[PDB]
């Protein structure tokens, strides 16, 4: 009932563990003995839910009755408890309990997990909540501890349009899975039932909720028209200029296509922009044999919003790996470091199609073509006689941050396909990595380096023995520091992704989550992880 000192500290280590790490028996035996003790720790509440075998129903009794005596725990551990380990409503129940003590702000950073997360969800109880069936035609076609993870969801979806339109997109493109189709027909089922419980929720609000459903419709329709329009052009016989004559013919007659002129909608992909329609003679495909369009929506204030409209792709993996360079941005943020990072927007509208938040930035590649080197072209479009090497300032400063945040973050995510072309930099400083393909470890090419830096990118930096590159390296160790400190949220975010498919992901799912877990190295202290840190640089430039 009361722990000795020796016991106090191993009990210490296991409420540390990392939220994916295997507590053993002798662990959960141990847990399990001073669970009364433990009562004032909330971070041990995760690691004594770990030890019950809900199967058992006098364990599961035991546990649920801890629960509502225990510490209440704080918002990124519950994230764990919506994972598939938990079937328990009651511990089902809990999470969504604490979910609501957060943030709107702080729930679109794990929407898209959380919609993940329903697949682990009672899927009659969603079903009970109605007062084959085309998925994009739902919102299109209208008629005239008591909370789930739908119930919750939909209700702050209510009262948030920004929360509305990716829970909107998320489930849309879930119901729009055809894998899930054919492998899993009730969770596509289930899925079909939280849109059809989504609309219905919408109908029975306020005059605002209300129009909220008629610019979801107003929205899916828009990209349905630009769907349709993309497929002309991808089947449109003849060269880039063919196509891009027709893909720009298309858009300017608004009567037949209806995407040039249209009333203030959100926009998918940052629903804050509100768009009037897209500038038809602007528009052009790129190069790429995928085809994608670059095209620049006319914004609510004379704003020109430029977009990537992919078609025929899955862009799931960059719009994970985007949502969570978007959190590890707000978190260093938080701890007051701001990298320059560029967590640009990217929503799929399908697994076929989706937007990407276009940034005007050159490729490192042709950087070095155009000028010869990175400080040759910010000597360019950046000069300062006062200034390091001939550069702005500011510009060094912005480049030797950007540069430290993507060098940890595309550690951390194991990132490859790593070529200068996949490398973009900014006339402001700002580099930042594209095309998301290979996570995880994967690589197009056999031994892949875990450090990606390049002898160009140091020499942008001034070279080795610069000034810059000492602040580079304390910035490189400072941001892995505060990102171990958040490796409870981001592998129980990791944790929530194992079954949604997701090409990188779906090949070892069972491992995954471990595999961003090493990354973090949590076995050696913040002073041996700075040396850890320093060593992955020193042997990038160095290879
Ligand atoms: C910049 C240009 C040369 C490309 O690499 C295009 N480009 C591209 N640009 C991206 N950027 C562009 C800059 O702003 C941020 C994101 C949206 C992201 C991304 O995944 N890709 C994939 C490869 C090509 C493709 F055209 F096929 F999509």
Same mark, same amino acid.
């Given at each position: 009932? +009361?722990?000795?000192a020796a016991?106090?500290?191993q009990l210490? !280590?296991?409420?540390?563990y990392p939220?994916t790490?295997?507590?053993?028996?002798?662990?959960?035996?141990?847990?399990?003995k001073? &669970?009364?003790?433990l009562?004032?720790?909330e971070?041990?509440?995760?690691?004594?839910?770990?030890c019950?075998?809900?199967?058992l129903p006098?364990?599961?009794?035991q *546990?649920?009755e801890l629960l509502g005596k225990?510490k209440?725990?704080?918002?990124?551990? #519950?994230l764990?408890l919506?994972?598939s380990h938990?079937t328990?409503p009651?511990? &089902?129940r809990y999470?969504?309990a604490?979910?609501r003590?957060?943030?709107?702000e702080d729930?679109?950073?794990?929407?898209?997990?959380?919609?993940?997360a329903l697949?682990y969800?009672?899927?009659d109880? $969603?079903?009970?909540?109605?007062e084959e069936?085309?998925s994009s035609?739902i919102?299109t076609?209208p008629?005239?501890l008591?909370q789930?993870?739908?119930?919750? %969801?939909i209700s702050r979806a209510?009262?948030?349009?920004?929360?509305?339109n990716?829970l909107?997109?998320y489930?849309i493109?879930?119901?729009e899975?055809?894998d899930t189709?054919?492998?899993?027909?009730?969770?596509?089922?289930?899925?079909?039932?939280v849109?059809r419980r989504f609309?219905?929720?919408?109908?029975?609000?306020?005059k605002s909720?209300?129009?909220?459903?008629?610019?979801?419709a107003a929205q899916?329709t828009?990209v349905?028209?630009l769907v349709?329009?993309?497929? *002309?052009?991808q089947?449109?016989?003849g060269?880039?200029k063919?196509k891009?004559?027709?893909?720009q013919?298309?858009?300017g007659?608004?009567?037949?296509?209806n995407?040039?002129?249209?009333?203030?909608?959100p926009?998918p992909?940052?629903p804050?922009?509100? $768009?009037? =329609?897209? !500038?038809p003679?602007? *528009?052009?495909?790129?190069?790429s044999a995928?085809?994608?369009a670059?095209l620049?929506?006319k914004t609510?204030?004379?704003?020109?919003?430029?977009?990537?409209?992919?078609? =025929?792709?899955?862009?799931?993996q960059?719009?994970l790996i985007?949502?969570?360079?978007s959190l590890?941005?707000k978190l260093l &943020?938080?701890?007051?470091?701001? %990298?320059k990072?560029?967590?640009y927007?990217?929503?799929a509208?399908?697994?076929?199609?989706?937007?990407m938040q276009f940034?005007?930035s050159?490729?490192?590649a042709e950087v070095?073509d155009t000028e010869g080197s990175?400080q040759?072209?910010?000597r360019?479009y *950046?000069?300062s006689?006062?200034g390091?090497?001939?550069?702005?300032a500011?510009?060094?400063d912005t480049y030797?941050? #950007?540069?430290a945040?993507?060098?940890? !973050?595309?550690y951390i995510? =194991?990132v490859?396909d790593?070529?200068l072309?996949?490398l973009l930099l900014?006339?402001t400083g700002k580099?930042?990595?594209?095309?998301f393909?290979?996570? %995880? =470890?994967?690589?197009?090419?056999p031994?892949?380096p875990?450090?990606?830096?390049? +002898?160009?990118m140091?020499?942008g930096?001034g070279?080795?023995?610069?000034?810059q590159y000492?602040?580079?390296?304390k910035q490189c160790?400072t941001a892995?520091?505060?990102?171990?400190?958040?490796?409870?949220?981001i592998?129980?975010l990791?944790?929530?992704?194992?079954?949604?498919? !997701?090409?990188?992901?779906a090949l070892?799912?069972?491992?995954?989550?471990?595999?961003?877990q090493?990354?973090?190295?949590l076995?050696?202290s913040?002073?041996?992880?700075v040396?850890?840190?320093?060593?992955?640089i020193?042997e990038?430039?160095h290879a």
């Amino acid at each position: 009932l +009361k722990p000795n000192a020796a016991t106090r500290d191993q009990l210490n !280590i296991i409420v540390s563990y990392p939220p994916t790490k295997q507590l053993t028996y002798e662990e959960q035996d141990l847990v399990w003995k001073f &669970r009364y003790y433990l009562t004032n720790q909330e971070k041990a509440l995760t690691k004594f839910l770990k030890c019950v075998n809900w199967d058992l129903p006098q364990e599961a009794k035991q *546990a649920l009755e801890l629960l509502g005596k225990w510490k209440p725990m704080d918002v990124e551990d #519950s994230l764990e408890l919506l994972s598939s380990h938990y079937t328990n409503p009651t511990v &089902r129940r809990y999470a969504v309990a604490r979910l609501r003590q957060a943030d709107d702000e702080d729930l679109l950073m794990y929407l898209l997990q959380l919609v993940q997360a329903l697949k682990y969800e009672n899927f009659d109880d $969603i079903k009970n909540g109605l007062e084959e069936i085309d998925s994009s035609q739902i919102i299109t076609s209208p008629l005239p501890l008591e909370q789930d993870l739908c119930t919750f %969801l939909i209700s702050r979806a209510c009262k948030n349009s920004t929360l509305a339109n990716y829970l909107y997109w998320y489930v849309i493109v879930e119901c729009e899975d055809q894998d899930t189709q054919q492998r899993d027909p009730k969770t596509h089922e289930m899925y079909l039932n939280v849109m059809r419980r989504f609309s219905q929720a919408l109908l029975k609000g306020d005059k605002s909720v209300r129009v909220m459903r008629s610019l979801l419709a107003a929205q899916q329709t828009f990209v349905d028209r630009l769907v349709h329009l993309m497929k *002309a052009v991808q089947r449109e016989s003849g060269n880039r200029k063919k196509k891009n004559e027709r893909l720009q013919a298309l858009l300017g007659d608004n009567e037949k296509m209806n995407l040039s002129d249209v009333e203030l909608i959100p926009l998918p992909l940052e629903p804050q922009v509100k $768009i009037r =329609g897209i !500038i038809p003679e602007t *528009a052009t495909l790129f190069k790429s044999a995928l085809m994608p369009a670059q095209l620049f929506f006319k914004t609510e204030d004379g704003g020109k919003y430029p977009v990537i409209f992919k078609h =025929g792709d899955d862009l799931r993996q960059d719009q994970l790996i985007l949502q969570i360079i978007s959190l590890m941005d707000k978190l260093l &943020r938080k701890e007051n470091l701001d %990298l320059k990072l560029t967590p640009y927007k990217v929503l799929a509208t399908s697994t076929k199609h989706g937007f990407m938040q276009f940034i005007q930035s050159v490729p490192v590649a042709e950087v070095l073509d155009t000028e010869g080197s990175i400080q040759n072209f910010f000597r360019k479009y *950046a000069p300062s006689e006062n200034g390091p090497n001939g550069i702005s300032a500011e510009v060094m400063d912005t480049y030797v941050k #950007s540069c430290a945040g993507y060098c940890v !973050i595309t550690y951390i995510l =194991g990132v490859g396909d790593r070529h200068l072309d996949n490398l973009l930099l900014t006339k402001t400083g700002k580099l930042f990595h594209i095309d998301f393909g290979y996570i %995880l =470890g994967r690589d197009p090419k056999p031994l892949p380096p875990p450090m990606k830096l390049n +002898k160009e990118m140091v020499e942008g930096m001034g070279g080795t023995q610069s000034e810059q590159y000492q602040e580079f390296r304390k910035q490189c160790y400072t941001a892995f520091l505060h990102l171990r400190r958040y490796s409870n949220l981001i592998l129980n975010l990791f944790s929530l992704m194992v079954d949604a498919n !997701i090409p990188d992901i779906a090949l070892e799912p069972d491992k995954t989550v471990k595999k961003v877990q090493d990354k973090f190295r949590l076995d050696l202290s913040d002073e041996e992880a700075v040396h850890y840190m320093q060593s992955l640089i020193d042997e990038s430039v160095h290879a």
